[PDB]
Design a protein around this ligand. Structure first.
Ligand SMILES: N[C@@H](CCC(=O)O)C(=O)O
Ligand SMILES: N[C@@H](CCC(=O)O)C(=O)O
Ligand SMILES: N[C@@H](CCC(=O)O)C(=O)O
Ligand SMILES: N[C@@H](CCC(=O)O)C(=O)O
Lengths: 449, 449, 449, 449
């Protein structure tokens, strides 16, 4: 589509200094050509040009004092990218690399991911260049208070609902929420999600991302007249997502056979499928040692230091740890191994070069992270519902809806790709399904945003 | 000061992509060494590190529709840099070059300028990459409405009071204000300054910047046991500031002998000192022709196309038009001419290379724009007072205070430079006087911002 | 002006059921032809069509309980007609005849009157069909509380500042204000004017309307190379306005020779010029007897029952009591008497037939009430200034400004009439001066309201 | 008055547990008998019963963390006692004895004091049982932030304007204000008074209480056909008030001859009348040593440890330090000495027994602190005016109004006492003048508060 190409070119030029953002826009917009060409009305109201500029961006100063009385200064961000279909929604990331480029790219993708859930959630991202590494609990608390002392005026249960991400977990959400309720003088606990149960968090929260990713893979098997049962799976990490996936894979008849750490990776041909094995991951996580070897030492399984587990021959690859984990190098190994299922779980775990490549392979099934990991934000949506109803749902209620939605995200994507003649292209399908709802809403709302 | 050098280095690295901002910080902070070295307490509360990061930055999407029904999208900014001593305050600039770097640099300087006025005004800057050139009146109106539809929630008479700048005049202020009062449902006319008289603008508004700059030069003459009477002056432009200065120079016994346009410059040895001559500038401005030749055609005076008037031998140089007007090339001519008085009137009309150079010259007097052009923002402060009192002052009241303050800005700067042993360095003096009030306020307010 | 005629015709048709409003619009708009014909731009933005429709109208239910526990229901109004040049401003009228027509007509005229003061005040009117006659003090208090319990959300010191009118005096203003400050939880005493001194009322309040009307007449004498000294004056009423006028006439060398009541009128060839005489009016007012005879009984002066004092031969006629007091019948007597000065003081004290007639008389000077009685609202403006400054001015400060403004309202009107070639037509002049400021502001504010 | 006696009896019974409050009510109400007996209408609307119950009381939890990371908990109060004539107004006291009783008594008296100023200021008091003694600057800052994090929602420039008192000075006001402006997102610097100049404090602030007390004494001399010149004066303390009084006494021809400290008192027959002597007080204050001996060591003047200076024979006694300083014991010495002028400067520096006693003495002049020390709150009122006008007044403007008002507070009190036949009773006169304005306002505002 000439219209699409034109917007990408203008973006590339205007936001040259924001490489991460430019690439994401290109990647998403480029898959929408067929849809946009079928809707000339979009161009007339400059829809794409509007979409690529966040509704509102806020940056602010965050001075705070350490345990020694020294004053530090960081910068806080919240990018409220698109609120056409629900209050802004998206996690908070505290990491020294954080800048506007990275917030806009994650925030643009968040809009598409949130649109897929089928719930009324807009897209946003925020965070700070504050580095939680090595800070005391008390230091993290004062930072969170000073961060919220400004942030509170831009968010709220019907406006913008943040949540956790890298560097931001239950603990930080708790401290921010305490400051919020104090300043505002009321409860409004739907202002943040990822909360502890005592003040409104949802059951299935910890399992959400991981289980969700397995329900999606299940819908993939079905599509392909195949089965999870018996399948082996390579994971990355030993964290939350990895824990949740391993757990549900095992329950489903499958088994994970690898985990990974900055120190290397393990191989466990038996499968991280026991209560004892599965639970230990929590331990290692706890431990704060940050080494995957511990599992190998504990269970007496292979530990290959300084190596990715992308070389092992398995049925399914699920990268659930960090960005740009799988590169060309690793993709080629995966290919060579004749792995059919490549399922992104963590955010942007694959480089593009790697992605196109995997995508050129005819026999392969490639699932994009914005769809596969939607389970967590989907449970954040259920948490906002529970908070608005002022009650809790049972675990069975939450898990059962989680399950039905993840299946629909898969099926919907396929149907959409197929409709625009793209085959079984889950990557473009996720983009298309996500874009359509947003477009419909923006077109109906007129030219205001 | 090691502390100062350290903050400049961290700024240079962190905001590499914001060259204009980096340079301004270096230029201002570097002159404060003596003051900072005398106040060790500043470093303990990380004062400079706080100061260089704006309290709050807001960017937002601005879709709007042209006379033909085509939809355009621009981006709006408001950088609320420092509000320690008054509501945020600073102009709006509509120009296609506008970006965050430029907003932060003008907004950082605005804090120092506003601090010098002696009135309670903080520092901010905002605007859009919208280009008013070639737009209809109706188009500018719809843009201003859509811009304000988001902006209103961040400003207010006690919070942030914008005003005009490049691309933003009475007309735009009028349209934004109409939208504001409609959305908010009340009067609150102190929300913007630069208003027309019918709805609360102040007398002496149009003359403000120009007259103020002449009262300052007057205080310079006095300092130097000299006199305006008889002096000749090179101006740049034929606009508002130039008009106001010429006018007051003439009244004071002096006379301007040049004006300037993108087309060249004129020389008028008699002096733009008559009602007829003086008033014609308004005409040319009106005319929208944008040519200084008109004056030469009209009055039959020299017109040197494609040339700056920096070569003419005069007593006083007052650049009142555009940035980086006076470069090394032009400074060397000025030097060669044995001009003692170089008085910046327009904002950053001189490059640094040019500035250091002029500043190395022992016999010369160099006045920085943040002090010299304070007259306009000073009248904006009087306008907020009048609006808060719900009455108007007479022209004599406003002009008489304008006069006394500009004298004090000069005298104060000198005294300050002298105190820290810098001689009669009006440039560092302006920075020091401005910084001190802000520092005092931030130190008293604690570590919150 | 064809444009003017067209708007009047559309008004007449659309608001047929609002006779009082239709007539006022016609009367005012018809005098603006020359101004509108000189400004084609007005028609392009449909300025007059906008002006004739109030920005906002609010009507509301007012249940309240009497001293016997019976529940009564009345209706409350506030018409916020035009706020282009200041917060809405205008009195509250409690009378059983009150309806929307009457509120809109008084509110449209209030905009023009407020514009003449030269202060930033918009135009509004409000009130209720509640009848204070025969109610207890306690009943009036509960009514005022219930009326304010809804009204408070539409007004405020920067939004809409009501004040007294027929049926609403200091006492009612006090009760409404008490309810306001309780609901809102703060002071904000600039929300209402006409307050008692103890909580922010202004000195010269009681004298305001009356004195103002005499300062205006003074400017008329000057215009006409004449003098107040020695002049005799027919007043109507024995109330506030009459009291204030008599008082200042006497001080100025003149003397009133009549007063009036529903019972008839008195004639006092000596002049209501003594402390004893002057003060007695207050008595009669107090007395609540409502009879002008009391003065005649007390001072032993003529009392002609059931008669208007419009028949007495005097230098100046100043009707300061009720509407449509002076009719054709009375105008013809005035004419026959060769009275040159006819000065409306009370609101619409003359019927139109009467007005045109007086206006056709070549030798006569006719002053419209919107200008002549501006003194009261002008002191309400000074009260808002004092409240905003959080201090009181002295009586001399208030009276001296009152005086200078009333002179300017006269002079300005004359100059304006003369400019559009209308002669010394104070009636059209008041309309023109008032309209111009409002137009300027609306044109500058764009098409929002 | 039976009505008065009845309200005192009901107060005594209902607030038995609040001794300080009960006594103050009795003391004030008992002097109002004559006024109340002249206004039967008061009893009908239960005016006194309303007056003795604060409009609103707020208490709140204040957790905060010390320099060692230990968590402390204190309690915060704000009693908004009466807002009939202006926003609530009154200081903040941080001392371990603070409780509701003490807040209500100081807050009830504050209403009467504020009413005397003639400015629109209501009456309030607040504070905490937090003890600033021995805390670090950083600790006081965190406390002030946590205190304001709750307090901000109850105050504001038009609602309730706190200020300093025991334990709360410029430094604490600065820290609270910084937190306020951060939470609220705007300037609103009129929210607190006693601010540093850099962010809106008024000139003459430090001198205010002391100078004011001397202008009042001056009006007393005049009343009594006497003179300050030559008079000697016993002060108490070496603080702010003492410094200000000594200073102005000296300028006026008088001289202080004593100062006092917890360590004893000094006698300086020459007079603390030199720049050197006067300025040294600041030193001692600074020093934080808390000993008056320093002055005696420095100037070589008598130092009587563990003794009050109430025994020295002087013309005028001005207790300017602490409560219940002058007891029966000290009063008897004063009496014995034939001192005619007893002028309370500090708050409640005299016990009642002592007060009645002094008051029974026929030849003596006794001035109550609520009137004499009104100078400070009067300058706080001028500061709110300056902040609302968004400018500064000169020192001469502030001092000259200070002077005229203090004279009026004296004269007004005398006239009032005399009117109700009480003689020259400055104590009852202050109560009566204060009560009358408040009563007038409450009666006009109806039964809402
Ligand atoms: N950080 C997760 C959770 C966000 C949310 O729950 O709002 C994400 O990227 O979706
Ligand atoms: N644009 C002018 C005016 C700003 C103002 O009046 O706030 C400046 O740079 O100062
Ligand atoms: N009722 C008066 C006073 C209104 C006011 O003071 O706002 C009028 O018609 O002007
Ligand atoms: N604490 C002083 C000052 C209070 C104020 O300025 O509001 C008093 O008791 O009056």
């Amino acid at each position: 589509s000439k219209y699409v190409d034109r917007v990408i070119a203008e973006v590339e030029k205007k936001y040259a200094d924001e490489p991460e953002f430019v690439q994401t826009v290109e990647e998403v917009l480029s898959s929408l050509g067929p849809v946009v060409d079928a809707h000339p009305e979009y161009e007339e109201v400059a829809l794409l040009e509007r979409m690529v500029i966040p509704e509102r961006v806020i940056e602010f100063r965050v001075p705070w004092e350490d345990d020694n009385g020294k004053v530090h200064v960081n910068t806080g961000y919240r990018v409220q990218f698109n609120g056409a279909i629900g209050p802004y929604k998206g996690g908070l990331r505290f990491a020294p690399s954080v800048n506007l480029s990275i917030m806009k790219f994650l925030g643009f993708e968040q809009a598409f991911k949130d649109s897929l859930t089928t719930l009324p959630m807009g897209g946003a991202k925020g965070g700070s260049d504050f580095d939680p590494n090595g800070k005391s609990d008390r230091e993290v608390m004062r930072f969170c208070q000073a961060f919220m002392t400004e942030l509170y005026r831009h968010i709220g249960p019907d406006i913008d609902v943040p949540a956790g991400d890298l560097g931001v977990g239950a603990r930080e959400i708790g401290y921010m929420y305490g400051q919020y309720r104090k300043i505002v003088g009321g409860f409004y606990n739907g202002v943040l999600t990822g909360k502890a149960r005592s003040f409104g968090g949802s059951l299935v929260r910890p399992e959400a991302t991981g289980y969700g990713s397995v329900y999606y893979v299940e819908a993939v098997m079905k599509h392909e007249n195949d089965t999870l049962v018996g399948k082996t799976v390579a994971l990355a990490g030993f964290g939350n997502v990895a824990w949740g996936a391993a757990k549900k894979l095992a329950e489903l008849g499958a088994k994970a056979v690898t985990l990974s750490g900055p120190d290397g990776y393990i191989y466990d041909p038996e499968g991280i499928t026991t209560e004892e094995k599965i639970n230990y991951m929590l331990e290692m996580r706890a431990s704060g040692r940050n080494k995957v070897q511990d599992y190998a030492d504990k269970f007496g399984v292979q530990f290959f230091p300084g190596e990715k587990p992308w070389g092992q021959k398995v049925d399914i690859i699920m990268p659930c740890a960090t960005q740009n984990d799988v590169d060309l190098e690793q993709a080629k190994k995966i290919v060579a191994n004749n792995v059919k299922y490549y399922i992104e779980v963590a955010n942007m775990p694959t480089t593009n070069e790697a992605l196109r490549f995997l995508m050129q392979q005819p026999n392969m099934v490639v699932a994009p992270s914005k769809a596969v990991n939607a389970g967590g934000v989907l449970v954040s949506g259920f948490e906002m519902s529970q908070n608005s109803e002022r009650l809790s749902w049972t675990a069975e209620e939450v898990d059962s809806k989680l399950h039905q939605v993840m299946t629909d995200i898969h099926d919907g994507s396929a149907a959409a790709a197929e409709r625009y003649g793209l085959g079984y292209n889950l990557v473009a399908g996720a983009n298309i399904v996500g874009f359509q709802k947003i477009a419909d809403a923006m077109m109906a709302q007129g030219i205001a945003w």
